């Protein structure tokens, strides 16, 4: 019966999006393929070989945030969300189930 | 800011249809494909950019249609009356009908081809459920109306 009034929306990294296909399943699809670590390279380069993939994945998943801030958000949702816990424990449960 | 509006004795849908009919049909048959479509093949080869329209061609087309017993709604008067809008109509008709190139161009060397190809690829990545451009960007030619002769 009433004409609308606008209110500002907001978006944040929900655990559902973190569990979308481009979320952690993307990590499982691509991390072991893309990160490579070797004695043939120094420690700084090996650390960079990790960080480059996780940064690109983080930006492609949630481009809004800086990489460190994204990491804090990920650590904190990891500290809290039950479905994310069930997923992570399911990963190590699958490794147990091998 | 509300606006009033009025009815007027013109229709740009009908005239757009007339313009593309002229473009895909006409040739200078008194001198015996269409002049304009052949010229647009020259445009497609990137051999030409100055697209010239003769009002005399429009007049000859109107007279041919009237001779064949159908009214052409005097496109010459319309283009002589509100010329600027009919640049947009003629260019849209060309963009809707220009044939593909025949001469090789090394097509990737144009930045616009690469950037619009990349946008198309990105849009297909989206379109798998996981205009493309404003047409003036892609429009390479320049369109000009050339006046009526003494008659």
């Amino acid at each position: 019966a009433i004409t609308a009034r606008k209110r500002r929306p907001q978006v944040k990294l929900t655990a559902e999006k973190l569990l979308s296909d481009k979320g952690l399943p993307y990590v499982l699809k691509n991390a072991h393929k893309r990160i490579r670590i070797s004695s043939k390279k120094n420690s700084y380069d090996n650390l960079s070989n990790i960080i480059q993939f996780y940064q690109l994945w983080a930006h492609e998943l949630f481009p809004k945030a800086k990489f460190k801030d994204f990491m804090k958000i990920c650590q904190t949702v990891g500290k809290t969300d039950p479905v994310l816990r069930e997923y992570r424990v399911s990963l190590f449960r699958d490794e147990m189930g091998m | 800011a509300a606006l009033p509006s009025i009815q007027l004795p013109v229709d740009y849908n009908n005239l757009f249809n007339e313009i593309t009919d002229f473009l895909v049909t006409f040739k200078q048959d008194t001198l015996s494909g269409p002049k304009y479509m052949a010229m647009l093949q020259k445009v497609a080869n990137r051999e030409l950019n100055s697209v010239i329209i003769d009002l005399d061609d429009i007049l000859q087309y109107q007279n041919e249609k009237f001779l064949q017993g159908t009214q052409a709604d005097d496109l010459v008067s319309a283009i002589q009356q509100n010329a600027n809008h009919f640049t947009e109509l003629f260019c849209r008709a060309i963009d809707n009908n220009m044939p593909l190139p025949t001469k090789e161009i090394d097509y990737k060397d144009d930045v616009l081809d690469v950037i619009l190809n990349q946008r198309r690829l990105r849009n297909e990545r989206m379109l798998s459920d996981r205009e493309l451009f404003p047409p003036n960007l892609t429009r390479r030619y320049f369109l000009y109306f050339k006046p009526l002769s003494q008659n």
Binding site: - | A2, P4, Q7
Partner: protein, 320 residues
Amino acid sequence: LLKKIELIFVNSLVVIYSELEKITLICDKKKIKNFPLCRALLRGQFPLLQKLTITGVTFPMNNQDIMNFQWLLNFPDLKELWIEDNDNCELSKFLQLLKFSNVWKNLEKLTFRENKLYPIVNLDEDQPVTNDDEVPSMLFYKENLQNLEKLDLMGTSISGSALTRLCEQEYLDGRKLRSLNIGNCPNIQFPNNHAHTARMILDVNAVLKRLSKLEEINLSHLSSLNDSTMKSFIINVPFLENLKRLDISHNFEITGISIYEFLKKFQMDQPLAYLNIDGCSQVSHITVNMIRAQNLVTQVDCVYERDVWRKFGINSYSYS
């Protein structure tokens, strides 16, 4: 048990129904790029349905039956029909349905409002015969439209002649009809004008002679109602003596001159009950204050700064 339902689809994200008496479907035209109840409306039947009110939905191009209002046959006894700002609908197709079926035994009210200027629609009085050795098709315009108390056609591109033909054919009864809205219709011209095709003329004398006892008129946004054209209403005052409520607001041509001479002539009938001239730029302040002082209108509204007419829920059900 649900008799009245109102779906107001503010946003988008990604059988017999005898109980239902009133259906309202209001949709934000920006967001609702589909027609939510289309399959239900075309397949099901809703026989008790007294009122239907559909706004803002986009009729799919892929199904011509939807565009031809074929679903709308499913609702007899539909006392009121309101249908507004549904972008891909047309009055043109609607009047085909009114031509070729006795679709309704009674409409008390109709309110059709397409948004864009579709091509000129004329009342299609062409009555074909299957063969000269056979009867024509009966044109069901009268028995469908006979019952209307309120006809609203605001913005619908209806030609003035089409409306005169509704009156001359007496498809509109004229006695049952008591309120009329044809505001914002560009294809309405008046006999005092000189620059038109004749089929856009609305012969107000013929029409007002037909439907004389109507109480309310709305010609709001009708730019074609210039001061010269208002002279037709002046000379036709004897054929509209039932009129109480007049809306000619948001007209950027109508000077206070026409208001005054219309009201002076109306006063030869005991003032007019109500007049709306909000948003009109040419209604001089001293003139409207003289109208009040002489008490020629019981109430006259002159909010020059009111930009819009579509009071939601009151004047329109197109959303916000």
